[PDB]
């Protein structure tokens, strides 16, 4: 139930859960939003026979809070093959070097 009524827009990282009646006229609405008063969150009303931009789209958009805090999540940074008996520029678990 995508929302269609709110007093204003949404702030960054602001979530709206109350289905408050969007009052626009100074006359009080109150109770059931009927005469010149209406409920929020209009339905999709979707059917399987529409155009292109008339279907649900899932979004997992990232908004990671990269502040001055240390980074917990990082890159997978996969490994390579292990080499023995001959010189390599190993970079084991952070500590670099070169040897056999």
């Amino acid at each position: 139930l995508y929302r269609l009524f709110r007093k204003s827009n949404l702030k960054p990282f602001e979530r709206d859960i109350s289905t408050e009646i969007y009052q626009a006229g100074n006359k009080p609405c109150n109770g059931v939003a009927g005469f010149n008063c209406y409920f929020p969150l209009r339905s999709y009303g979707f059917r399987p026979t529409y155009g292109v931009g008339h279907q649900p789209y899932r979004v997992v958009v990232l908004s990671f809070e990269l502040l001055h805090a240390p980074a917990t999540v990082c890159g997978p940074k996969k490994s390579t093959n292990l080499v023995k008996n001959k010189c390599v520029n190993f970079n084991f678990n952070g500590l670099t070097g070169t040897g056999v």
Partner: protein
């Protein structure tokens, strides 16, 4: 805390929420038409009535606003597109009883039952098969017999209903601030406030008559020349210098004159360019005719049709084991899912009708940003006009010689182009004077000038003015002469046919301005011309939020009613008719009757 805020709020709701119900109604009627079953009739039993009820409720809650001081003008356009309350505007009892009377007095006409006094086993039905016994009957007297039997069988009960309807329908719209109920559809696209791009309800009637001074050298010449070719089959019943009886036409009253073409060919030794032999090659079907149509639809510049059209509508045969309807209808389903109610087979007329609905779809999708209640054409007669001019562009000889329909080396014949022009003219420009004269008189009658006892006698007198249709014998107040047409029984919107025909070929002319087609006219495609596609792109998107004549005035160059495009379309035909009218007469001596 003002009228503007709540007006915009409830209309922003209404657009989408009522587009949802309109889409529901459209899919219901679609499922019925595609699948005639026991319970698909219910698809209409809950769609149109609920749409009308929702319209009435939204109008009732919308008219509480002044809807005049708001800064936006489109909001008023959809609000003035919402104020069609309909039915009861003055009193519930009278309006509702008249509507219920219509509910049965329209189906009594649509029944099409004829009980001949000679033998009941022969009947005349309103089906197109009647054209084989009235429009294209072999015997000369059989046409007259069919006309008289049809009249005497269907129109006996149609007089009191029509009289009471016309008398009692005025005040309903007169309390609706509309001068007579004809103002409901005469001034549908009448908007005030802004000069230049405005309309006047009384302007139409006064502009009807004076715009045919230059039409007469074309329509009158076409009427006179073809009349000279009616003598070879109607001995002692022609009088080419005068008029012709009403049963000597392709229509019972004078709407269609094309059924006389086979008798009235200019030169019969050469046939018109036909594409049927082309389907001898591989038998283009609907799924293939639609695809090959894109050669002059993709190259225009505008996108394709809807992606959902090619997955829901039938392609080969809707019948199978399923009753279905495939009639020519312009469909706007909404919600970005637009489709065609037609199956295209090996037929030139099917090829034409294939492009009509898809051009309609392109038009509708070109203005997806319009408000839902404003998601139509400029007026009644502009939505279908551009939708059908694409159909009219299918049979284009300069384009037929591109996709194997005709070899691009055969030279155009001496009169085959003129032959096709004359054949097509008798249907479109041979029908415009009908609405020019009879519909104008009908509007004048709606104004109330004709008394209670002049409805039938005066029709014959004023049919001796422009159209020129005469009858062997007049009739007293015991027949159904004037109101006996399928579209005159329920005050159908004839402006959808009037501004259709007046503004017909101006769209094609505007298409061909940047297409560099100056020598040949009346047949020119917009293939391989992006400028032509992008200059009428405004035409296909204007809708109703924009003024009805914004792109029309900016591109075509004729804001008001135009006469030049009609003459220029048939310019070779007009010149040929004006040249080969020797040894004959052009005008009609109306004061003549063969029966007397």
């Amino acid at each position: 805390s003002t009228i503007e805020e709540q007006a915009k709020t409830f209309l922003d709701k209404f657009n989408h929420e009522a587009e949802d119900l309109f889409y529901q109604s459209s899919l219901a009627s679609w499922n019925y038409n595609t699948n005639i079953t026991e319970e698909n009739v219910q698809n209409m039993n809950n769609a149109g009535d609920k749409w009308s009820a929702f319209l009435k409720e939204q109008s009732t809650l919308a008219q509480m606003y002044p809807l005049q001081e708001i800064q936006n003008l489109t909001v008023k356009l959809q609000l003035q597109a919402l104020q069609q309350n309909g039915s009861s505007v003055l009193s519930e009892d009278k309006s509702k009883r008249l509507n219920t009377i219509l509910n049965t007095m329209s189906t009594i006409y649509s029944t099409g039952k004829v009980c001949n006094p000679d033998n009941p086993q022969e009947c005349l039905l309103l089906e197109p098969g009647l054209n084989e016994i009235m429009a294209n009957s072999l015997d000369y007297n059989e046409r007259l017999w069919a006309w008289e039997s049809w009249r005497s069988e269907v129109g006996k009960q149609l007089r009191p209903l029509y009289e009471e309807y016309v008398v009692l329908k005025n005040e309903m719209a007169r309390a609706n601030h509309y001068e007579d109920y004809g103002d409901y559809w005469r001034g549908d696209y009448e908007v005030n406030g802004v000069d230049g791009y405005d309309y006047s309800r009384g302007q139409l009637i006064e502009d009807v008559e004076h715009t045919f001074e230059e039409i007469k050298p074309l329509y009158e010449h076409l009427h006179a020349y073809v009349r000279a070719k009616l003598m070879n089959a109607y001995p002692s019943y022609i009088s080419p210098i005068g008029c012709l009886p009403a049963h000597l036409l392709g229509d019972m009253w004078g709407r269609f004159w094309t059924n006389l073409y086979s008798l009235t060919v200019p030169f019969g030794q050469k046939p018109n360019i036909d594409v049927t032999d082309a389907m001898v090659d591989q038998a283009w079907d609907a799924q293939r005719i639609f695809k090959e149509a894109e050669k002059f639809f993709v190259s225009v510049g505008l996108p394709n049709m809807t992606q959902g059209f090619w997955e829901n509508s039938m392609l080969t045969d809707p019948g199978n084991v399923q009753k279905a309807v495939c009639h020519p209808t312009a469909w706007d389903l909404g919600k970005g899912d637009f489709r065609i109610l037609m199956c295209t087979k090996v037929t030139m007329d099917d090829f034409l009708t294939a492009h009509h609905e898809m051009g309609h779809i392109q038009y509708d999708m070109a203005y997806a940003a319009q408000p839902f209640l404003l998601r139509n054409g400029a007026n009644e007669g502009f939505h279908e006009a551009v939708g059908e001019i694409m159909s009219l562009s299918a049979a284009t000889p300069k384009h037929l010689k591109s996709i194997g329909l005709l070899s691009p080396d055969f030279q155009e014949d001496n009169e085959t182009e003129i032959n096709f022009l004359l054949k097509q003219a008798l249907t479109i420009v041979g029908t415009l004077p009908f609405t020019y004269m009879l519909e104008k008189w009908r509007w004048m009658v709606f104004k109330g000038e004709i008394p209670k006892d002049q409805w039938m006698k005066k029709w014959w007198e004023m049919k001796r003015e422009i159209v020129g249709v005469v009858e062997p014998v007049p009739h007293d107040e015991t027949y159904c002469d004037p109101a006996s047409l399928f579209h005159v029984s329920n005050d159908y919107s004839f402006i959808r046919y009037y501004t259709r025909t007046l503004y017909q070929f101006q769209f094609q002319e505007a298409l061909c301005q940047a297409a560099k087609h100056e020598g040949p006219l009346h047949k020119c495609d917009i293939s391989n011309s992006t400028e032509a596609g992008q200059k009428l792109f405004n035409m296909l998107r204007l809708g109703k939020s924009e003024p009805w004549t914004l792109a029309l005035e900016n591109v075509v160059g004729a804001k008001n009613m135009n006469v030049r495009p009609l003459l220029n379309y048939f310019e070779p035909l007009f010149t040929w008719l004006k040249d080969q009218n020797k040894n004959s007469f052009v005008g009609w001596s109306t004061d003549w009757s063969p029966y007397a």
